Amino acid sequence: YAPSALVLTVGKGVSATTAAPERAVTLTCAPGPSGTHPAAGSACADLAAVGGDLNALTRGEDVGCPKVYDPVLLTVDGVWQGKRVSYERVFSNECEMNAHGSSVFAF
Amino acid sequence: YAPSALVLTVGKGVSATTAAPERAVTLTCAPGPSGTHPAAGSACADLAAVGGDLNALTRGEDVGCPKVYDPVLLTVDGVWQGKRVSYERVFSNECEMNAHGSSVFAF
Amino acid sequence: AQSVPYGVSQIKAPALHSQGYTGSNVKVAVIDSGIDSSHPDLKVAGGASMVPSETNPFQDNNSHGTHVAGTVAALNNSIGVLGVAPSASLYAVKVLGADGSGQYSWIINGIEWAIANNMDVINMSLGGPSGSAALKAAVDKAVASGVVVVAAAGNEGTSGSSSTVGYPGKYPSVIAVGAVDSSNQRASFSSVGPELDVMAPGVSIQSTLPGNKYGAYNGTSMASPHVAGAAALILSKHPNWTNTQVRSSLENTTTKLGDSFYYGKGLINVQAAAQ
Amino acid sequence: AQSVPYGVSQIKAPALHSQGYTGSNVKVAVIDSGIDSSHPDLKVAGGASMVPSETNPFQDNNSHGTHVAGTVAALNNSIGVLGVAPSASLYAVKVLGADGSGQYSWIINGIEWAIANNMDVINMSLGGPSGSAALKAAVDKAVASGVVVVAAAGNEGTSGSSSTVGYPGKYPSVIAVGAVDSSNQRASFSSVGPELDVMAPGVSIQSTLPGNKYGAYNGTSMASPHVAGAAALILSKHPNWTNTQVRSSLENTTTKLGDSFYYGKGLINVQAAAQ
Ligand SMILES: [Ca+2]
Ligand SMILES: [Ca+2]
Ligand SMILES: [Ca+2]
Ligand SMILES: [Ca+2]
């Protein structure tokens, strides 16, 4: 009985709010993958892979983004293995962030 | 384009964590109601009613709970009208909390 | 072996039980979630259910109600615990569901069952923050009827200098019980305000649970059946004392603790009440 | 009217344009997201796409690439802005999708198109944090080939005393551009480390956007086409100078700013470069 539920936001800005959220989704891997995630099954799969640890999501390796600075802020809140979560990160642009996990940020 | 997504947890305890989450759901009213909520449509309807403001959820009026003290902690995180959220409350027991909104806490 | 929860002791019950007063021939209605009638440390005379979808008074799906019932009459043998009023006739008026939730009109209806079936004492370890004309009318008629009425103060600790006493215990016609520890310290969650009558042991009160189990709980809920069992012993000593006499007795012989917004009159002492 | 972005000025471009050096007859390939060829302040010679699902080099669905292209050759008329090298032949090597994301092998492939089609200068305002044997081989062959190679330092500001310069600009064969403001202050997001060559204006750099629009942007990305347009003018003055000569020229005539982990050699000065 995996207590699992996340919500994800993203807006231009360098901090939580002094940076509105322009997109927001929810993911749930428990028991099976669902939520508003145009890529649930992979994300679960992602976190599973890294076993729920944002901070450990191999960036890209062979993907390049435009070197523009339009900072984007990523928030994640919920539980994983009934373990709480409250992560937030800032990527220099939106391509960076997308090259970040594989599918977590498939958003 | 209502940026809307919440996640809800609940565990015995007086604080966020030094109180595991034993149950967790996600709700989404935007555009329409969905999520893991054995009562989505009402909750949306609830928040809509109160227009997303936890702190304003008429308790009961004509429902009584057992006067046992088994404190339960409620967390809510997300966005409402693309407005962020980070609410958490402690009810003296679990009946209290259920008598709280109508359906938000329909959990 | 059998053990005596500290609470039965805090209140001087055994002194009475020593002199032959065990609550015998007295009818106590526990309005609540029902009562496991199949536990060995309990003996349930009868009862009824106001819960439409949960109609066996003797099936406590919450455990709550069983816990409470045990603080009033846990039998007096060589097993389990010991109720305050061990030979008391126990009635299960169920008005609380499995979730411990019950409509006011169920509560109300339960009170009415008890008046008609001539209970002497009623225990209501339930409460909500708003009251109503019917509920108030309900407990008011019990008292006119001669029933002693007891109920939990509430678990909302303090809140300014405002009262946190819920209903029906806010109503002046109901004895409202707050909770203290083995040290006579009020438990923190205990409701305060001027509608509080007395205090009783309500922190880690060990009683009976559904399925031949025993366990410990906390709450103003656990304090009430102390006062309820209390009322009951006094009537085994003095069976034609009015409820007024019994009430009056309980509140005039308390050991005074703190200031009355936090402690009312203080910890009851039935030994001292029975005179 | 036409306006001259401060950046074209920071770097002394107009001095050259005054003496007849406008980057004319020089082939600059902008490897990127493509370039709106239908904007009035741009004139696009030709180009190709390595993006399999996005095969028109002249359709910039990101705008990025259009912005950059404009910092190199925005035409010189009575409208819009002004490129650094206004008469430069512009090529759109698209290797970035609508999302501004492109595989290394697309980048690589784009470089290869440019070598074969004899570009003189290549601008790569793209980058990732890890490199590879092929990518490195890629820029290395450009240079052997005689192409001047320029690329954004990266936008990861600082991080200990570790380098935050991404690829391909980390590679010593690529000129790597960091970014300064109108005050020659390095922008904060600007990457640092020993692989940084020079700085250029990369904060609120106003250029052309898809749909006859003009707007301002920030990034090491905006700094590169400054150096790229730079390279280009020097070749309009000296068309049979090797890339080595041109590189060497740019880095030996910089105005020195801070310490080189943060500024490399300093702000380029093409006026001073063309001799
Ligand atoms: Ca016993
Ligand atoms: Ca009262
Ligand atoms: Ca122009
Ligand atoms: Ca370099």
From Swiss-Prot, chains A, B:
Regions annotated as coiled coil: none
Keyword Repeat: yes
Annotated compartments: Secreted
Quaternary state and interactors: Homodimer.
One GO MF term: serine-type endopeptidase inhibitor activity
Family per record: Belongs to the protease inhibitor I16 (SSI) family.
Keywords: Disulfide bond, Protease inhibitor, Repeat, Secreted, Serine protease inhibitor, Signal
GO cellular component, one term: extracellular region
Lineage: superkingdom: Bacteria
Protein name: Subtilisin inhibitor
Keyword Signal: yes
Biological role stated in the UniProt entry: Strong inhibitor of bacterial serine proteases such as subtilisin.
Disulfide linkage: 29-44, 65-95
Residues the record marks as site: Reactive bond for subtilisin: 67-68
Species whose genome carries this gene: Streptomyces albogriseolus
Sequence repeat locations: 2-6
Swiss-Prot record, chains C, D:
Domain Peptidase S8: 5-274
EC class (word): hydrolase
Subcellular localization, as worded in the UniProt entry: Secreted
Active site per the UniProt annotation: 32 (charge relay system), 64 (charge relay system), 221 (charge relay system)
Keyword Metal-binding applies: yes
Co-factor(s): Ca(2+)
This protein's name: Subtilisin BPN'
Biotechnology: Used as a detergent protease. Sold under the name Alcalase by Novozymes.
Keyword terms: Calcium, Hydrolase, Metal-binding, Protease, Secreted, Serine protease, Signal, Sporulation, Zymogen
Gene assigned in the entry: apr
Temperature note: Optimum temperature is 48 degrees Celsius.
Mechanisms controlling activity: Completely inhibited by phenylmethylsulfony fluoride (PMSF) and partially inhibited by benzamidine hydrochloride, leupeptin, and pepstatin A.
UniProt function note: Subtilisin is an extracellular alkaline serine protease, it catalyzes the hydrolysis of proteins and peptide amides. Has a high substrate specificity to fibrin.
Residue window of the full protein shown: 108 to 382 of 382
CC annotations in GO: extracellular region
Keyword Metal-binding: yes
Extra remark: Secretion of subtilisin is associated with onset of sporulation, and many mutations which block sporulation at early stages affect expression levels of subtilisin. However, subtilisin is not necessary for normal sporulation.
UniProt GO BP: fibrinolysis; proteolysis; sporulation resulting in formation of a cellular spore
Residues annotated as binding Ca(2+) 2: 169, 171, 174
Lineage summary: Bacteria, Bacillati, Bacillota, Bacilli, Bacillales
Organism, scientific name: Bacillus amyloliquefaciens (Bacillus velezensis)
EC numbers: 3.4.21.62
Binding, Ca(2+) 1: 2, 41, 75, 77, 79, 81
Comment on pH dependence: Optimum pH is 9.0.
Comment on bound cofactor: Binds 2 calcium ions per subunit.
Family stated for the protein in its record: Belongs to the peptidase S8 family.
GO molecular-function terms, A-Z: metal ion binding; serine-type endopeptidase activity
